[PDB]
Structure formats: structure tokens, C-alpha cells
């Protein structure tokens, strides 16, 4: 797969959600989508709009929540 | 820069154009250059290097 190894900075994320995800210590898109809705929503200063826009960019990049990973990284 | 125009402009003249401090325009240019530095756009450009 050539799309899972791209850095999470490619997602064009705002600063607040970027800081929240850095606190979650996520740097790969597969690691970004390994978790779920509530698990990422529990983080402080991250609202429904942040994860909503994350899902929007994932859908615009041909991804949809509910997948799983195998042998990564 | 001098892109598709006659002359380039120092940031003071652009600040007069946009009714804003020379500093703010420096910030805008730095932010835009940072944005274009990002991948998914730098590949086609850096193929010219």
C-alpha cells in the first residue's frame, strides 16, 4: 500500500487538532485510523468538528472508518 | 515577486495596496511559503531541480 505511509501532516489539519493528535502521539495515517470516534474525541480541546473534518478529508482521500490494519509499521 | 506582471513590489507598497502593516504581509508570505513547502505540491516543483 502506497498511501498509508504518508505523514499525517498531509491531511491538512488545523493547529488545534494537530496539537491534540500530537498529544495522542500519532504520525502515520494507518495509526490515525487505527483508533475510533470516541477514543479520539476523549482528548481535551478536540471537539466533534475536528474529528468531523478529519473524517471529511479521509472520505475525500478515499477512506472510511471501520477498517483495520495488518503488520504496520 | 514579478509573476505575470511588470514589476515586483516591496512589501511596503503591497501593504499600502492591502491597507495593512509591512509586518503582516511578511507573515502572510511566510505562511504561504510554508504551505507550498508541504508535500503533495512540492514534488512537481522540485522536479525542476
PDB file of C-alpha atoms in Angstrom:
ATOM      1  CA  UNK A   1       0.000   0.000   0.000  1.00  0.00           C
ATOM      2  CA  UNK A   2       1.434   3.380  -1.049  1.00  0.00           C
ATOM      3  CA  UNK A   3      -0.972   5.659   0.857  1.00  0.00           C
ATOM      4  CA  UNK A   4      -0.743   4.501   4.496  1.00  0.00           C
ATOM      5  CA  UNK A   5       2.904   5.532   4.985  1.00  0.00           C
ATOM      6  CA  UNK A   6       2.354   9.193   4.085  1.00  0.00           C
ATOM      7  CA  UNK A   7       2.814  11.522   7.094  1.00  0.00           C
ATOM      8  CA  UNK A   8      -0.272  12.740   8.942  1.00  0.00           C
ATOM      9  CA  UNK A   9       0.766  16.302   8.053  1.00  0.00           C
ATOM     10  CA  UNK A  10      -0.593  15.541   4.566  1.00  0.00           C
ATOM     11  CA  UNK A  11      -4.160  15.637   5.926  1.00  0.00           C
ATOM     12  CA  UNK A  12      -4.177  19.482   6.016  1.00  0.00           C
ATOM     13  CA  UNK A  13      -5.244  19.670   9.658  1.00  0.00           C
ATOM     14  CA  UNK A  14      -5.724  22.807  11.744  1.00  0.00           C
ATOM     15  CA  UNK A  15      -3.353  23.693  14.572  1.00  0.00           C
ATOM     16  CA  UNK A  16      -5.675  22.801  17.473  1.00  0.00           C
ATOM     17  CA  UNK A  17      -6.445  19.310  16.170  1.00  0.00           C
ATOM     18  CA  UNK A  18      -2.793  18.888  15.163  1.00  0.00           C
ATOM     19  CA  UNK A  19      -1.692  19.594  18.741  1.00  0.00           C
ATOM     20  CA  UNK A  20      -4.343  17.206  20.073  1.00  0.00           C
ATOM     21  CA  UNK A  21      -3.141  14.443  17.735  1.00  0.00           C
ATOM     22  CA  UNK A  22       0.496  15.135  18.640  1.00  0.00           C
ATOM     23  CA  UNK A  23      -0.551  14.685  22.268  1.00  0.00           C
ATOM     24  CA  UNK A  24      -2.077  11.394  21.109  1.00  0.00           C
ATOM     25  CA  UNK A  25       1.343  10.680  19.500  1.00  0.00           C
ATOM     26  CA  UNK A  26       0.132   9.700  16.029  1.00  0.00           C
ATOM     27  CA  UNK A  27       2.351  10.138  12.967  1.00  0.00           C
ATOM     28  CA  UNK A  28       1.030   7.606  10.413  1.00  0.00           C
ATOM     29  CA  UNK A  29      -2.306   7.626   8.593  1.00  0.00           C
ATOM     30  CA  UNK A  30      -2.840   3.970   9.454  1.00  0.00           C
ATOM     31  CA  UNK A  31      -2.118   4.870  13.071  1.00  0.00           C
ATOM     32  CA  UNK A  32      -4.511   7.800  12.598  1.00  0.00           C
ATOM     33  CA  UNK A  33      -7.332   5.455  11.551  1.00  0.00           C
ATOM     34  CA  UNK A  34      -6.478   2.605  13.946  1.00  0.00           C
ATOM     35  CA  UNK A  35      -8.435   4.298  16.746  1.00  0.00           C
ATOM     36  CA  UNK A  36     -12.147   5.159  16.706  1.00  0.00           C
ATOM     37  CA  UNK A  37     -14.605   8.029  17.191  1.00  0.00           C
ATOM     38  CA  UNK A  38     -14.915   8.231  20.984  1.00  0.00           C
ATOM     39  CA  UNK A  39     -11.278   7.267  21.605  1.00  0.00           C
ATOM     40  CA  UNK A  40     -10.004  10.312  19.711  1.00  0.00           C
ATOM     41  CA  UNK A  41     -12.893  12.522  20.875  1.00  0.00           C
ATOM     42  CA  UNK A  42     -11.976  11.998  24.545  1.00  0.00           C
ATOM     43  CA  UNK A  43      -8.875  14.162  24.086  1.00  0.00           C
ATOM     44  CA  UNK A  44      -9.022  17.677  25.577  1.00  0.00           C
ATOM     45  CA  UNK A  45      -9.633  20.700  23.323  1.00  0.00           C
ATOM     46  CA  UNK A  46     -10.790  18.471  20.429  1.00  0.00           C
ATOM     47  CA  UNK A  47     -14.466  18.739  19.529  1.00  0.00           C
ATOM     48  CA  UNK A  48     -16.870  16.977  17.214  1.00  0.00           C
ATOM     49  CA  UNK A  49     -15.983  19.433  14.435  1.00  0.00           C
ATOM     50  CA  UNK A  50     -12.296  18.447  14.496  1.00  0.00           C
ATOM     51  CA  UNK A  51     -12.937  14.722  14.068  1.00  0.00           C
ATOM     52  CA  UNK A  52     -15.723  15.567  11.605  1.00  0.00           C
ATOM     53  CA  UNK A  53     -13.287  17.465   9.378  1.00  0.00           C
ATOM     54  CA  UNK A  54     -10.748  14.650   9.794  1.00  0.00           C
ATOM     55  CA  UNK A  55     -13.355  12.173   8.550  1.00  0.00           C
ATOM     56  CA  UNK A  56     -14.231  14.576   5.721  1.00  0.00           C
ATOM     57  CA  UNK A  57     -10.639  14.715   4.487  1.00  0.00           C
ATOM     58  CA  UNK A  58     -10.392  10.925   4.880  1.00  0.00           C
ATOM     59  CA  UNK A  59     -13.505  10.479   2.727  1.00  0.00           C
ATOM     60  CA  UNK A  60     -12.139  12.938   0.163  1.00  0.00           C
ATOM     61  CA  UNK A  61      -8.980  10.784   0.162  1.00  0.00           C
ATOM     62  CA  UNK A  62     -10.887   7.537  -0.362  1.00  0.00           C
ATOM     63  CA  UNK A  63     -11.036   6.332   3.245  1.00  0.00           C
ATOM     64  CA  UNK A  64     -13.913   5.454   5.556  1.00  0.00           C
ATOM     65  CA  UNK A  65     -13.869   4.484   9.225  1.00  0.00           C
ATOM     66  CA  UNK A  66     -14.343   0.836  10.102  1.00  0.00           C
ATOM     67  CA  UNK A  67     -11.154  -0.554   8.543  1.00  0.00           C
ATOM     68  CA  UNK A  68      -8.336  -2.487  10.211  1.00  0.00           C
ATOM     69  CA  UNK A  69      -4.569  -2.741   9.810  1.00  0.00           C
ATOM     70  CA  UNK A  70      -2.231  -5.703   9.388  1.00  0.00           C
ATOM     71  CA  UNK A  71       1.529  -5.657  10.067  1.00  0.00           C
ATOM     72  CA  UNK A  72       2.054  -1.905  10.314  1.00  0.00           C
ATOM     73  CA  UNK A  73       4.581  -0.496  10.664  1.00  0.00           C
TER      74      UNK A  73
ATOM     75  CA  UNK B   1       7.704  38.524  -6.906  1.00  0.00           C
ATOM     76  CA  UNK B   2       7.322  39.589 -10.522  1.00  0.00           C
ATOM     77  CA  UNK B   3       4.901  36.856 -11.555  1.00  0.00           C
ATOM     78  CA  UNK B   4       2.685  37.662 -14.582  1.00  0.00           C
ATOM     79  CA  UNK B   5       3.116  41.408 -14.005  1.00  0.00           C
ATOM     80  CA  UNK B   6       5.553  44.146 -14.960  1.00  0.00           C
ATOM     81  CA  UNK B   7       7.438  44.785 -11.717  1.00  0.00           C
ATOM     82  CA  UNK B   8       7.842  43.171  -8.342  1.00  0.00           C
ATOM     83  CA  UNK B   9       6.901  45.137  -5.240  1.00  0.00           C
ATOM     84  CA  UNK B  10       8.496  45.670  -1.882  1.00  0.00           C
ATOM     85  CA  UNK B  11       6.208  44.706   0.962  1.00  0.00           C
ATOM     86  CA  UNK B  12       5.550  48.347   1.893  1.00  0.00           C
ATOM     87  CA  UNK B  13       3.816  49.002  -1.433  1.00  0.00           C
ATOM     88  CA  UNK B  14       1.807  45.799  -1.055  1.00  0.00           C
ATOM     89  CA  UNK B  15       0.875  46.898   2.458  1.00  0.00           C
ATOM     90  CA  UNK B  16      -0.405  50.157   1.011  1.00  0.00           C
ATOM     91  CA  UNK B  17      -2.335  48.120  -1.563  1.00  0.00           C
ATOM     92  CA  UNK B  18      -3.998  45.946   1.096  1.00  0.00           C
ATOM     93  CA  UNK B  19      -4.199  48.638   3.832  1.00  0.00           C
ATOM     94  CA  UNK B  20      -2.044  46.700   6.284  1.00  0.00           C
ATOM     95  CA  UNK B  21       1.371  46.798   8.026  1.00  0.00           C
ATOM     96  CA  UNK B  22       4.519  45.569   6.174  1.00  0.00           C
ATOM     97  CA  UNK B  23       4.956  43.001   9.032  1.00  0.00           C
ATOM     98  CA  UNK B  24       1.559  41.335   8.437  1.00  0.00           C
ATOM     99  CA  UNK B  25       2.403  40.857   4.759  1.00  0.00           C
ATOM    100  CA  UNK B  26       5.703  39.278   5.770  1.00  0.00           C
ATOM    101  CA  UNK B  27       3.707  36.869   7.940  1.00  0.00           C
ATOM    102  CA  UNK B  28       1.339  36.105   5.057  1.00  0.00           C
ATOM    103  CA  UNK B  29       4.249  35.369   2.726  1.00  0.00           C
ATOM    104  CA  UNK B  30       5.962  33.164   5.305  1.00  0.00           C
ATOM    105  CA  UNK B  31       2.748  31.214   5.905  1.00  0.00           C
ATOM    106  CA  UNK B  32       2.061  30.724   2.192  1.00  0.00           C
ATOM    107  CA  UNK B  33       5.650  29.646   1.544  1.00  0.00           C
ATOM    108  CA  UNK B  34       5.375  27.190   4.436  1.00  0.00           C
ATOM    109  CA  UNK B  35       2.157  25.852   2.903  1.00  0.00           C
ATOM    110  CA  UNK B  36       3.762  25.337  -0.501  1.00  0.00           C
ATOM    111  CA  UNK B  37       6.785  23.697   1.151  1.00  0.00           C
ATOM    112  CA  UNK B  38       4.454  20.881   2.198  1.00  0.00           C
ATOM    113  CA  UNK B  39       4.368  17.630   0.190  1.00  0.00           C
ATOM    114  CA  UNK B  40       1.600  16.772  -2.319  1.00  0.00           C
ATOM    115  CA  UNK B  41       2.623  20.043  -4.019  1.00  0.00           C
ATOM    116  CA  UNK B  42       6.415  20.232  -3.771  1.00  0.00           C
ATOM    117  CA  UNK B  43       7.048  17.195  -5.986  1.00  0.00           C
ATOM    118  CA  UNK B  44       6.162  18.778  -9.334  1.00  0.00           C
ATOM    119  CA  UNK B  45       8.087  21.932  -8.417  1.00  0.00           C
ATOM    120  CA  UNK B  46      11.211  20.175  -7.140  1.00  0.00           C
ATOM    121  CA  UNK B  47      11.319  18.100 -10.303  1.00  0.00           C
ATOM    122  CA  UNK B  48      12.741  21.359 -11.720  1.00  0.00           C
ATOM    123  CA  UNK B  49      15.824  20.899  -9.513  1.00  0.00           C
TER     124      UNK B  49
END
